[PDB]
């Protein structure tokens, strides 16, 4: 599955597990 | 011990200094929860996390917010709350928009 | 999962 984190300041990283 | 299926209820995004997607959850046993953003598992960080209200005595229902801090148009999208326990699964989705997209 | 609640919240876990 993929996941998403929001690090603020418009920064979204996706992570592919 | 009164056993019954997990349940959820999702409300439209509200602004309260920070942004909140309000929700309720219920079930016995107490359900497990997860959030999705556009179908992807949402990892909680200091800028997006679950925040509960203290529960009242003699009630199994839990209320809270998916709290977003300083979101922008990138956070616009589909939020899903998933809950499960041994007697049932529940799911609810809403669209949220926090800023206009350039 | 929960940023605020490493041990869950009154039974609810991530």
Swiss-Prot record, chain B:
Induction text: Isoform TrkA-III is up-regulated upon hypoxia in cells normally expressing it.
Ig-like C2-type domain boundaries: 19-85
Disulphide-bridged cysteine pairs: 20-65
PTM notes: Ligand-mediated autophosphorylation. Interaction with SQSTM1 is phosphotyrosine-dependent. N-glycosylated. Isoform TrkA-I and isoform TrkA-II are N-glycosylated.
Subcellular location: Cell membrane; Early endosome membrane; Late endosome membrane; Recycling endosome membrane
Annotated glycan sites: 1, 38, 43, 58, 78
Tissue expression pattern: Isoform TrkA-I is found in most non-neuronal tissues. Isoform TrkA-II is primarily expressed in neuronal cells. TrkA-III is specifically expressed by pluripotent neural stem and neural crest progenitors.
Superkingdom in the source lineage: Eukaryota
UniProt function note: Receptor tyrosine kinase involved in the development and the maturation of the central and peripheral nervous systems through regulation of proliferation, differentiation and survival of sympathetic and nervous neurons. High affinity receptor for NGF which is its primary ligand. Can also bind and be activated by NTF3/neurotrophin-3. However, NTF3 only supports axonal extension through NTRK1 but has no effect on neuron survival. Upon dimeric NGF ligand-binding, undergoes homodimerization, autophosphorylation and activation.
Note, other: Trk also stands for tropomyosin-related kinase since it was first isolated as an oncogenic protein which was the result of a fusion between the tropomyosin gene TPM3 and NTRK1.
Disease: Congenital insensitivity to pain with anhidrosis: Characterized by a congenital insensitivity to pain, anhidrosis (absence of sweating), absence of reaction to noxious stimuli, self-mutilating behavior, and intellectual disability. This rare autosomal recessive disorder is also known as congenital sensory neuropathy with anhidrosis or hereditary sensory and autonomic neuropathy type IV or familial dysautonomia type II. Chromosomal aberrations involving NTRK1 are found in papillary thyroid carcinomas (PTCs). Translocation t(1;3)(q21;q11) with TFG generates the TRKT3 (TRK-T3) transcript by fusing TFG to the 3'-end of NTRK1. A rearrangement with TPM3 generates the TRK transcript by fusing TPM3 to the 3'-end of NTRK1. An intrachromosomal rearrangement that links the protein kinase domain of NTRK1 to the 5'-end of the TPR gene forms the fusion protein TRK-T1. TRK-T1 is a 55 kDa protein reacting with antibodies against the C-terminus of the NTRK1 protein.
UniProt note: domains: The transmembrane domain mediates interaction with KIDINS220. The extracellular domain mediates interaction with NGFR.
Quaternary structure, from the entry: Exists in a dynamic equilibrium between monomeric (low affinity) and dimeric (high affinity) structures. Homodimerization is induced by binding of a NGF dimer. Interacts with SQSTM1; bridges NTRK1 to NGFR. Forms a ternary complex with NGFR and KIDINS220; this complex is affected by the expression levels of KIDINS220 and an increase in KIDINS220 expression leads to a decreased association of NGFR and NTRK1. Interacts with SH2D1A; regulates NTRK1. Interacts (phosphorylated upon activation by NGF) with SHC1; mediates SHC1 phosphorylation and activation.
Assigned protein family: Belongs to the protein kinase superfamily. Tyr protein kinase family. Insulin receptor subfamily.
Protein name per UniProt: High affinity nerve growth factor receptor
Origin species: Homo sapiens (Human)
Recorded name of the encoding gene: NTRK1
């Amino acid at each position: 599955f993929k996941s998403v984190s929001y690090w603020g300041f418009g920064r979204l990283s996706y992570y592919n597990h | 011990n009164v056993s019954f299926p997990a349940s959820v209820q999702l409300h439209t995004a509200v602004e309260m200094h920070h942004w909140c997607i309000p929700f309720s959850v219920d079930g016995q046993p107490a359900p497990s929860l997860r959030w999705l953003f556009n179908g992807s598992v949402l990892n909680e960080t200091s800028f997006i996390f679950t925040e509960f209200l203290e529960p009242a005595a003699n009630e199994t229902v839990r209320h809270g917010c998916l709290r977003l801090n300083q979101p922008t148009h990138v956070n616009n999208g589909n939020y899903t709350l998933l809950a499960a326990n041994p007697f049932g699964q529940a799911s609810a989705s809403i669209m949220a928009a926090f800023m206009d997209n350039p | 999962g929960f940023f605020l609640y490493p041990h869950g919240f009154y039974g609810i876990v991530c």
